[PDB]
Symmetry: D2
Subunit: 727 residues, 4 copies
């Protein structure tokens, strides 16, 4: 045949295009000129296709790939069909075990560069010079669900970064909240068992809203801090581009003089912090369970590269015990009001992978993979993680040679006396496979530690204690950080936390677990406890009403850096606006709308009651991106309704529903000319309302008003009004 069309419409343009303009494709075909040392080094295993003959894996050309070999055209298939058997066998063996946690994830390639040399505090080569660029590979993920679960669940998110440094791979394997649920790695199977689907029936997926999770939390108050972050809007990010990242544990930075400095790692999203609202997130898991995966991929194809600032909280070794919390306790955060985040460098994700399985699914990150200039601490959760990644990757990725899988390979040299193992790629020519050896003059050889290019030596921390299985008494405080978090949130963020706990505990079948969680909230803050209790039909006791609130954290009664929205940081580039078309669109409005959006890097999606095209007043042919039902308001940041023949869409139920949903979800809406007739559906004032942009036409200040609302993300003042709308 064949039938790719004559117009060449099958193939997407190899240039940045806005979401939905062209079919997506493998990164190296979408952006062939985007390169980095790692992307180039993968060239040996990239496999093309065009102009090549179809063959078996042994290189034999196939003549007929449509039929098995049989004795007669209606006869039995013959065992000698080696073509069919290789093809079916490889298909039969396609799947590998998904990760134990973080199985649902989306990744991209990029690069990192420090703003200045950090040689006074660390000898890490990748932070030693502002013009030294280090390729990275980043994988973002949910945490509980399987690899086929949905993106916009309520859950913690993983944020893992593989740095291909000149002195080794450093993996920074963090999450989107600055603490973890538990204190010691020994409890990790217990916690993860409690949050994952229950064992009898394997329900629920991607949800902590079930009895065993809340049983565990209620019995293990150390979890309450991260639970508070998960119940807030932090648990439902708008995009991986708009959430923070944290390494959680205190690590060490080691300089050339041997000085150790404690450090906690942060990633700041340069697109700003932004989250969905629960009803929107939950409905989006049904409308588009691949929303975050798609959003990341389309941002990079559009040139809206995710950018993050690496930042360090630095504490001198002499200040280890100066806080009212233990620095080694992963359930405690270090307030930025106490220890500021120093900016360190920028990370840009600018290329999607070519093959998700080969590059994303087989990537292996490990917090153990550190480099000279970095070291660990005794945090008891970090200590046990050091054992687990290595162990799980051998079974997940089939053997001990997972570092030879292309995405995992260092770009710098690697030489040692390790040999064999399943799927061994490297063919070693060294005469010796042991050291010391004389037969190869002891090569490859050990290298002493030094200021640069030196071997790894651990910091010589003094260890003094008996061999004990004991929690440090300093870790036995569970309510002051949850309280600090609570008081740092805005009133509307506090309401959403309450709503999250209420919704989750309403799904817990055993009422006494609900009551025990409420009792724990009474140890954090009474207003919080009472608001959740009222939603659960629970009444606090007199004793509960008199629980003394936990102490402030080093005199802090709040830290605004813990809130998503108290300090504006809203950027609109990369956001999307739905434009609800009609069959006689006033092109003056459309011109003005698209020009204003284009100027700020905001994308548009043209919607209608059907697919195809509609023609504007002026004759302009407009292509329809999707239908009102086909691409609901859940997927956009704002909605504009231009003037024209509004009767065409005024009696359309889907069109009205579109605005009711967007209104409920606090998204800015802009109506021009006769589009103002839609105000009745969303029942608000004859004279108007903050959050609803309206004018006779879409001109000068109309688009400016709409853009200012989008920079603020959502219209929080509309909260009290949304409860009367049936949406």
């Amino acid at each position: 045949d064949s039938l790719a069309p004559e117009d060449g419409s099958h193939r997407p343009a190899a240039e940045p295009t806005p979401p939905g303009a062209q079919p997506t494709a493998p990164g190296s075909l979408k952006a062939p000129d985007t390169r980095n040392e790692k992307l180039n080094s993968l060239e040996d295993v990239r496999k093309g296709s065009e102009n090549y003959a179809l063959t078996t894996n042994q290189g034999v050309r196939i003549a007929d790939d449509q039929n098995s070999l049989r004795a007669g055209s209606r006869g039995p298939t013959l065992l000698e069909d080696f073509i069919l058997r290789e093809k079916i066998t490889h298909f039969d063996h396609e799947r590998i075990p998904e990760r134990i946690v973080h199985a649902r994830g989306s990744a991209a390639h990029g690069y990192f560069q420090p703003y200045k040399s950090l040689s006074d505090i660390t000898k890490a080569d990748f932070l030693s010079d502002p013009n030294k660029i280090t390729p990275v590979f980043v994988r973002f993920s949910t945490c509980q669900g399987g690899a086929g679960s949905a993106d916009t669940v309520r859950d913690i998110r993983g944020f893992a970064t593989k740095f291909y440094t000149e002195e080794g791979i450093f993996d920074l394997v963090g999450n989107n909240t600055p603490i973890f649920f538990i204190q010691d790695a020994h409890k990790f199977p217990d916690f993860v068992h409690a949050v994952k689907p229950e064992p009898h029936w394997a329900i629920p997926q991607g949800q902590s809203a079930h009895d065993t999770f809340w049983d565990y939390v209620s019995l293990q108050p150390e979890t309450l801090h991260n639970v508070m972050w998960a119940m807030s809007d932090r648990g439902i990010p708008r995009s991986y581009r708009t959430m923070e990242g944290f390494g959680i544990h205190t690590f060490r930075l080691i300089n050339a003089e041997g000085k150790a400095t404690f450090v906690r790692f942060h990633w700041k999203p340069l697109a700003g912090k932004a989250s969905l609202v629960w009803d929107e997130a939950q409905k989006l898991t049904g409308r588009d369970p691949d929303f975050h995966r798609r959003e990341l991929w389309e941002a990079i194809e559009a040139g809206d590269f995710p950018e993050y600032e690496l930042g360090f909280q630095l504490i001198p070794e002499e200040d280890e015990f100066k806080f009212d919390f233990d620095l080694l306790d992963p359930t405690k955060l270090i307030p930025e009001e106490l220890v500021p985040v120093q900016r360190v460098g920028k990370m840009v994700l600018n290329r999607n992978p070519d093959n998700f399985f080969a590059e994303n699914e087989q990537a292996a990150f490990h917090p153990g993979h550190i480099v000279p200039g970095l070291d660990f601490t005794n945090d008891p959760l970090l200590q046990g993680r050091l054992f687990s990644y290595t162990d799980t990757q051998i079974s997940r990725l089939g053997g001990p040679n997972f570092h030879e899988i292309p995405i995992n390979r260092p770009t710098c040299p690697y030489h040692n006396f390790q040999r064999d193992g399943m799927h061994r790629m490297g063919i070693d020519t060294n005469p010796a496979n042991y050291e010391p050896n004389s037969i190869n003059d002891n090569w490859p050889r050990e290298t002493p530690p030094g200021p640069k290019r030196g071997g790894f030596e651990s910091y010589q921390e003094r260890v003094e204690g008996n061999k004990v299985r004991e929690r440090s008494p300093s870790f036995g405080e569970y309510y002051s950080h949850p309280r600090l978090f609570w008081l740092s949130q805005t009133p509307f963020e506090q309401r959403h936390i309450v709503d999250g706990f209420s919704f989750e505990l309403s799904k817990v079948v055993r009422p006494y677990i609900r009551e025990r969680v409420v009792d724990q909230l009474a140890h954090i803050d009474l207003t919080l406890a009472q608001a959740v209790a009222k939603n659960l039909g629970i009444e606090l006791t007199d004793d509960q009403l008199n629980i003394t609130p936990p102490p402030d954290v080093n005199g802090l009664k709040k830290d605004p850096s813990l809130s998503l929205y108290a300090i504006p940081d809203g950027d609109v580039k990369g956001r999307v606006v739905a434009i609800l078309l009609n069959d006689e669109v006033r092109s003056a409005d459309l011109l003005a709308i698209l020009k204003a959006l284009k100027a700020k890097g905001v994308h548009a999606k043209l919607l209608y009651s059907r697919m195809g095209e509609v023609t504007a007043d002026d004759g302009t042919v407009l292509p329809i991106a999707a239908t009102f039902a086909g691409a609901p308001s859940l997927t956009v940041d704002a909605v504009i309704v231009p003037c024209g023949n509004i009767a065409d869409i005024a009696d359309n139920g889907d069109a009205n529903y579109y605005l009711m949903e967007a209104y409920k979800h606090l998204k800015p809406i802009a109506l021009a000319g006769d589009a103002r007739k839609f105000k009745a559906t969303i029942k608000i004032a004859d004279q108007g309302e903050e959050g609803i942009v309206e004018a006779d036409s879409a001109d000068g200040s109309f688009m400016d008003e709409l853009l200012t609302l989008m920079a603020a993300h959502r219209v929080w003042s509309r909260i009290p009004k949304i409860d009367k709308i049936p949406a």
Copy 2:
């Protein structure tokens, strides 16, 4: 200790109860008196819990299952903590590869019995006497999505039955529509690749609504029949109890005299045929991605046993 409440409300009643009345539980605890030969034969590997000491896998009692062994209560974790290492090791290796297709599925135990002896057309032992009961294990599934994807997607459903007969295991591995998309098994990897998530970005999950599926369909008209069924409300069943089942292929029955009879296998839902509507099914993928799994489980806990002829 003593974390359970003194009114015993942690434990669900061991008697049929309506959906939502009691917490769900393992079948043998919820219905200890429901038995069959296969269920009885699994007793040798069933492991209890109550009143036993917590141990390693080698039988060593654990004293402190809350902490790793370290040098000092704020010190480094020690390599000799064999208890931590067994526990983390087993956790680290919990997962196995999901099924290539039909990775999302929900299953139950039951039994079969023929209405009358079918010896005139087949010598299969399990079809030879109305009083002969055959334990079964049935797994229903979606077809495209992974094991963690949602139940009420638009897709073909699998309906697989393992009959534990006295002359061997017979597995009847069918779907909820009477035909399949393709004609020759050589094309199965092509079709499946086309319907599954696209390879550059692995989207979309649980959906045939993407370009590669329709490209393949457009190029292979043999697919149109099953496509018609999938696009109908057949592709969004109300429950596994309310859909039909088919073996699809023509098989043979062979009687004692050696006569072969062509046969196609069917399962009729005794609860009747019933499907959702698209907007409902898609929204239900978001509000309860485990809706069919939950519905199956709770119907059985309530005594509303799924029955098929």
Copy 3:
């Protein structure tokens, strides 16, 4: 540091050197200028060592590769030691499952070239042009034992050849005998279980001399033909360089016009056929269980490259039923007297691998791997093999991407829609992973069958019959081929067959199995059966004595091509002679001996009672290779004793034993001057005897005589005399 010596004696010369002259080494270091297309394409995975730092697999330099990280120098090891954990983990996972059969094997690289274009009979591209060179990788093996078992056991040998052709990989997976034990693949697990170590105790290794094997054989007379070959000296080859190879099955050759020709594949050893004798092979299993592996590696390092001529027996389609046996029956051979072997091309093995595990142990051959121009037949052993190799290789090599392990990769192009699988190396950029597709204009595309570069199409053989599990009546004849083999053997080869059966059946514990085997031998030949029975204390019945011998094969009462030795083909290049020195060797004799050996490509190993050196009469310092006991006569082809101070070695028990062993095992012996005193230890007459070269000095005709004996391999006329020697 500095472990290597200053004289550079740790490093072997990168030039051809005789066995034992230099330490052996990886092939690319030993022979860097030897190349072929496959060796060159492996360069991307070869890893060096000299002048590089020692690192983890992630690229981090190691400073101390001698110690674990601990709390205090006498303290507990710390979980955070990621360097120790990676190194120990990779060691812990070094082994993979051995092959189910042919686990013990030795391999080398080389090349093949046809003598002329065979386009008239086959369109296979690698046989299309005399100038077309095809790289090969060949693995020879025993069949029963584990990878750690001994080389010189009595067993069939595997001979597998991977051809890296321009139109795909062609694997020719043969054995050193022209038939197999069984007729249908369904019984392979039964046969292999019977031959392998018994299941209760896992004894015996590398031996078919145990009850279950002979039980099976006695019950399944189809096995008798191959058992005859295995009991002959064919089951104990001198080296892989001196055995034959066969494809066994009838396959097909397909030309451009579509004509099918039946073909059986053969390999002829250009060094000639040669085998050990049983006592020598058994003792060598103890002294040097790696004898064949060492002999192959050392021959290539010396430039004595193994050479084999590929040959075809061709039968026209219309002659399928012209013989007394079925061409599809793999327990039947095609006598060369009926169908000559046509010479096709030459194969030369000229480079050893770099890493045994990576290249040899992970190599995967499959008889299924054919190319356009070749096809299968209905042989029911071959048919079942087509299924098995695919299946076993996935578990053995870890997944469905074993074709990406370097040694298995094709050198020609390979492109298809297969994806994923554990350890996926290739990163596919095709936008499509299915066909037919329009999104990549249907590439990679199928190719029609044609005269060259065409897609594979099976020959359209007519199939007619019911679906049955039934053996063809034509295969139900079991004794005529065993009888033809027996009658084709020399008298001393016949005696060795008798002795094989007798030794093996003496180790069968259940006497009735021995008796049943003797009864089977009575159906093949009465002389054979009575000679085995007399060694077992079994007396044939009158009925056994009157069993009619089976018919001749197509009129043939013998075929000399079935004998190892009936038609001389002895070459001496590559063979070794032990020279037994004394403390005052006569230099004149040594000069002449070495020069004559050197001129024919025969190696020498200078032996003495101790290591070090000895000084010859004229001051020549003579380096000692090994001692009389450290390098027994088992390892050499002949023994020369030069003149000098014979008293120094005449009272040496080890020296005398050296000659008694060599004598017993039929090796040529040459004694010069006072060395003739050793004649009494081997009880040879005063006058002399054929096979013992003697003179006053070692020159003119003495070396010619010895080399003439070496060309005839062993001294068969001395068999009657070796019985009286206590050795």
Copy 4:
């Protein structure tokens, strides 16, 4: 785990303890034991925290390491006493 195929090698007959073994570990390739415990974690109230930890004691007690005193720096160094 790689030699014997997964983390349930303790269920291979020759390796099995003859004494009781109960805990919250689940799944893994070739899982033989079918756990009926409502809970797969601890602490839990839904099975009244069983199976439960046991204090160390004279007999039938839980395992507790001997409280050896550790005092030193983190070092990759051979004791001089071993030289």
